[PDB]
From a paper:
The scavenger receptors usually consist of one or more repeats of the scavenger receptor cysteine-rich domain (SRCRD) protein, which is an ancient and highly conserved protein module comprising about 110 residues. SRCRD proteins have been classified into two types based on the number of cysteine residues; Type A proteins are encoded by two exons and contain six cysteine residues, whereas Type B proteins typically contain eight cysteines and are encoded by one exon. SALSA, which is also as known as deleted in malignant brain tumors 1 (DMBT1) and salivary agglutinin (SAG), is a member of the scavenger receptor family that was thought to be involved in the oral clearance of microorganisms because of its bacterial agglutination properties. This protein contains 14 Type B SRCRDs separated by SRCR-interspersed domains (SIDs).
However, the proteins obtained contained aggregates, thus requiring further refolding. Therefore, further refolding was performed using the GSH/GSSG redox system, for the formation of appropriate disulfide bonds by the cysteines of SRCRD. Noodle-shaped crystals formed in the condition with 0.2 M lithium citrate tribasic tetrahydrate, 25%–30% w/v polyethylene glycol 3,350, pH 6.0–7.0. However, the crystallization of SRCRD prepared using this purification and refolding strategy was not very reproducible, and crystals did not always grow. Although crystals were finally obtained, the crystallization could not be stably repeated. The highest resolution of the noodle-shaped crystal obtained here was determined to be 2.54 Å, and one asymmetric unit contained one molecule. The space group of the noodle-shaped crystal was determined to be P 32 2 1, with unit cell parameters of a = 71.08 Å, b = 71.08 Å, and c = 55.36 Å.
Numbering used by the authors: 7 to 113
Write the structure that this text describes.
């Protein structure tokens, strides 16, 4: 029921990262967003390994809440929200900072 998808990306394996928290799809700030974070996302979606982790709303801007920020994944986590971060709904971003991924399974 805590879910994740990629949107405005062209296939399911690349897009803006969004997370279903408490009935709402919300976004992820790009502040420490790297390919370790994007691997956790790609692995958790079954899209494999990450080819990049673009910041600056490269797949546009969400209009939900911003649900995660300062994500600092070791790389071995199952789910993005199990990584270290500043806690649910704690962020210092706007949606222009929304984080995205491209995965291997993207065409």
């Amino acid at each position: 029921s805590l879910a994740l998808r990629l949107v405005n990306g062209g296939d399911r394996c690349q897009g803006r990262v969004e997370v279903l928290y408490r009935g709402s799809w919300g976004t992820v700030c790009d502040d420490y967003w790297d390919t370790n974070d994007a691997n956790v996302v790609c692995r958790q979606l079954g899209c494999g390994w990450a080819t990049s982790a673009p910041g600056n709303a490269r797949f546009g801007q969400g209009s939900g809440p911003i649900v995660l920020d300062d994500v600092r994944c070791s790389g071995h986590e199952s789910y993005l929200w199990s990584c270290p971060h500043n806690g649910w709904l704690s962020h210092n971003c706007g949606h222009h900072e929304d984080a995205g991924v491209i995965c291997s399974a993207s065409q």
